[PDB]
Amino acid sequence: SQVFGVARIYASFNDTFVHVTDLSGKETIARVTGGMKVKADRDESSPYAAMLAAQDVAAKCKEVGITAVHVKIRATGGTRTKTPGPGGQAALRALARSGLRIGRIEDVTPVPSDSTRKKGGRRGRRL
Amino acid sequence: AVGKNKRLSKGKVVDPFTRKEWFDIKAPSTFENRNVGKTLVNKSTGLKSASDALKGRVVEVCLADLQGSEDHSFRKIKLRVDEVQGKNLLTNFHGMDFTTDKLRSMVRKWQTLIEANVTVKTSDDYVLRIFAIAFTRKQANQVKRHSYAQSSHIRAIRKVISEILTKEVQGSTLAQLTSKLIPEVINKEIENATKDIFPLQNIHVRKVKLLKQPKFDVGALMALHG
Amino acid sequence: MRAKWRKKRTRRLKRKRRKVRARSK
Amino acid sequence: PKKRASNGRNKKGRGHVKPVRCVNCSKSIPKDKAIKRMAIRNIVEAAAVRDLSEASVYPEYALPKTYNKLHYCVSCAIHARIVRVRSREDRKNRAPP
Amino acid sequence: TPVTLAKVIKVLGRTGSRGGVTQVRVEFLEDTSRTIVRNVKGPVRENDILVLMESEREARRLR
Amino acid sequence: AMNPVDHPHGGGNHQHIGKASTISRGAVSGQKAGLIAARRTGLLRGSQKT
RNA sequence: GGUGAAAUUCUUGGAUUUAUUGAAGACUAACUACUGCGAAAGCAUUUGCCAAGGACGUUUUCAUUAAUCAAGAACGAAAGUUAGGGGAUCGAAGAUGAUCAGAUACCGUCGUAGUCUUAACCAUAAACUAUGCCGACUAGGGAUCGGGUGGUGUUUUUUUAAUGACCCACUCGGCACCUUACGAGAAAUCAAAGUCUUUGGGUUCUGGGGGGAGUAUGGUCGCAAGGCUGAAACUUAAAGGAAUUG
Ligand SMILES: [Mg+2]
Ligand SMILES: [Mg+2]
Ligand SMILES: [Mg+2]
Ligand SMILES: [Mg+2]
Ligand SMILES: [Mg+2]
Ligand SMILES: [Mg+2]
Ligand SMILES: [Mg+2]
Ligand SMILES: [Mg+2]
Ligand SMILES: [Mg+2]
Ligand SMILES: [Mg+2]
Ligand SMILES: [Mg+2]
Ligand SMILES: [Mg+2]
Ligand SMILES: [Mg+2]
């Protein structure tokens, strides 16, 4: 009935990745980022840019044949913020309103078991 | 962010989806649904052998999809391709895992988190690492607010659990385990051994992962996809 | 000035006075 | 003068606390002295739920949640519309809002 | 050039450093029972109708 | 410390080499004195990253 | 990619991103607490081995063997030193981009020592509870950790016993907490910082206006860095503590 995919949205600060793959994940379709739609070098992480990026991922899926996607939201993770970027959540809304169908939403942010060391020094990033 | 590329080539177009063919993913016999989905591979050329470019793939599927019931909503299942025949690429069990939200849900403070893992080998020489997790609970009528274990029940809890995990593995090759994790018989069996030690709510065991696999034995896999 | 860097300034001074006095013995 | 009895923190009989890093500026801060806040939010929004429902197979799926424990330093919390500053008699209250 | 006609159902308040931009939540005339919140420059009242050159953004609501 | 007749590094009014003491792998007998086919020189700093 | 914004930087030789693996070293998240253990420094995955320890229980034993201690001794964060291993990550120095009037800083990208470990040094810290140790007495209240006692108290086995986990009462010991001020204090505050002009339970250590100064010099310890001990000439009428109002 429905041919499935994996949205694999990477919500981060300074960018946003939206690119669907196969159910295995090896073969990728329609990799477009937020920084490809707005020429600001600052609005890359903006929700509007991610919304425009999410539309292009959806547009290519119908041509390929994929009608529904699974969703995996991801933050930077590791020793970094672990909080999804501002535009990643807007990209998911654009994916759902573009005619595709959603199932099996999951948060896939990598979390360590108290990993090596966070950058910035002891006193922190004093700005 | 668009017109800012200084250079594209260090030294200095064809549609890729006009040369791709879809396939069908088939789940093993110990699952209610077999139609996992589809995959993308280029057509096999003379020297490409696109079947070989597909054998090592691993696909993640929710157990609620295989069983059709959302009682296994979290219950992540990984299936590894082992054989390709006539558009019907065949997979075998590769590992079970928990969704992030489910594991983040059960871990609450003012209760003890007890974990145990084993390195037991199955009957069919599959080597598995089974992880078990359980949490303490407040008894009915309890007034104190944390209900912490005493780090000596936990050793007893961990020791008893490790015996259960290995025992249920030895004597079952790979499909009994796959058909034992579905009904959560181990989760119900763990509590009956640990109830007299301490309450231990939330015994949803944990992920299971394969360490090393035996010789391919193409006959065994075909015995599942009957 | 900071007491930390007055400690540091004096230690450097004592280095030289321990070194110029070594030129004689 | 001594501003607080606990003096910043929750160390009475610990000696050393093995600090943790701030999530906003990577500043090292002892874990007891840290200003831990727990962030539990739904997966999408209070507004995207209207559109993620009909556009989803498995009707009424789960509306799953995200769980995250945030640590702030004394400076990062005050600057972020958090525990900022109280009066001398309000400082003694330990009850959450 | 598709444009969207949405109708104001309730004003929220004034946002911006100078307060000149009003925060209002509107309802789409066609495909109703769907509501969006937008930022408006001029003086806006209830039951007003707004034209949206692009109607896929949830405007940043101060809270 | 040698005369030029004896070694490549011989000779001079001061004791020195005069030319780079890193030698090609394709040099011949009589030329391969010093550091043969050296990928780097100087004090090693950090991990070898082998 | 990073930022308030950029640039250094990486990219058609495929950067970023996706998937399957493999190696290395570090760390021990969530659970994690006005909770626990240790003389302090300090200590959080699992299991095995080795020795240790407090409290509790005790109608066991010895019998004053005790308390505090110049000299002396053991341990003693981080950084640093010596020599091997290791060297992922972060990162004194250094190199760079940016900001700036300048910016040898804060921000960015690299990045050596170091970070990790073995053998030996160093002997410092806002090493803080800025509160020495032993002993007795003096107001109330709840909670919690460890042990013990009692209660036909609740639940699981084998409805049923014993245990286990909870509930109620008491108790010994511990980490603290709330109220008040009999009392104390210059006040902040304090169940000790109280029982101190109604001045004496035992004992150790340290201070005598602010600078010069923890400086010179002489010793002694250290491989070094430095540690411990430690002046004088001179100069000054105030420095300083807690609260009050602007
Ligand atoms: Mg002050
Ligand atoms: Mg690539
Ligand atoms: Mg404990
Ligand atoms: Mg752990
Ligand atoms: Mg004694
Ligand atoms: Mg000292
Ligand atoms: Mg200390
Ligand atoms: Mg008590
Ligand atoms: Mg008790
Ligand atoms: Mg205690
Ligand atoms: Mg005097
Ligand atoms: Mg004096
Ligand atoms: Mg003052």
From Swiss-Prot, chain A:
It is found in: Cytoplasm; Nucleus, Nucleolus. HAMAP family: Ribosomal_uS11. The keyword Ubl conjugation does not apply. One of its GO terms (molecular function) is small ribosomal subunit rRNA binding. SUPFAM superfamilies: Translational machinery components. Component of the ribosome, a large ribonucleoprotein complex responsible for the synthesis of proteins in the cell. The small ribosomal subunit (SSU) binds messenger RNAs (mRNAs) and translates the encoded message by selecting cognate aminoacyl-transfer RNA (tRNA) molecules. The large subunit (LSU) contains the ribosomal catalytic site termed the peptidyl transferase center (PTC), which catalyzes the formation of peptide bonds, thereby polymerizing the amino acids delivered by tRNAs into a polypeptide chain. Belongs to the universal ribosomal protein uS11 family. One of its GO terms (biological process) is maturation of SSU-rRNA. Gene3D superfamilies: Ribosomal protein S11. Keywords: Cytoplasm, Nucleus, Ribonucleoprotein, Ribosomal protein, Ribosome biogenesis, rRNA processing. Present with 3370 molecules/cell in log phase SD medium. There are 2 genes for uS11 in yeast. GO terms for cellular component: cytosol; cytosolic small ribosomal subunit; nucleolus; small-subunit processome. Residues 107-127 are annotated as: Disordered. The keyword Nucleus applies. Pfam families: Ribosomal_S11. Residues 118-127 have a biased composition (Basic residues). Component of the small ribosomal subunit (SSU). Mature yeast ribosomes consist of a small (40S) and a large (60S) subunit. The 40S small subunit contains 1 molecule of ribosomal RNA (18S rRNA) and 33 different proteins (encoded by 57 genes). The large 60S subunit contains 3 rRNA molecules (25S, 5.8S and 5S rRNA) and 46 different proteins (encoded by 81 genes). uS11 interacts with eS1 forming part of the mRNA exit tunnel. uS11 interacts with snoRNA U3. uS11 interacts with MPP10. Component of the ribosomal small subunit (SSU) processome composed of at least 40 protein subunits and snoRNA U3. This is Small ribosomal subunit protein uS11B.
Curated annotation (Swiss-Prot), chain F:
Signal peptide: none annotated. Coiled coil: none annotated. This is Large ribosomal subunit protein uL2A. Belongs to the universal ribosomal protein uL2 family. The lineage of its organism: Eukaryota, Fungi, Dikarya, Ascomycota, Saccharomycotina. There are 2 genes for uL2 in yeast. It is found in: Cytoplasm. Disulfide bonds: none annotated. Component of the ribosome, a large ribonucleoprotein complex responsible for the synthesis of proteins in the cell. The small ribosomal subunit (SSU) binds messenger RNAs (mRNAs) and translates the encoded message by selecting cognate aminoacyl-transfer RNA (tRNA) molecules. The large subunit (LSU) contains the ribosomal catalytic site termed the peptidyl transferase center (PTC), which catalyzes the formation of peptide bonds, thereby polymerizing the amino acids delivered by tRNAs into a polypeptide chain. It comes from Saccharomyces cerevisiae (strain ATCC 204508 / S288c) (Baker's yeast). The chain holds residues 203 to 252 of 254 of the full protein. The modification Phosphoserine is found at S47.
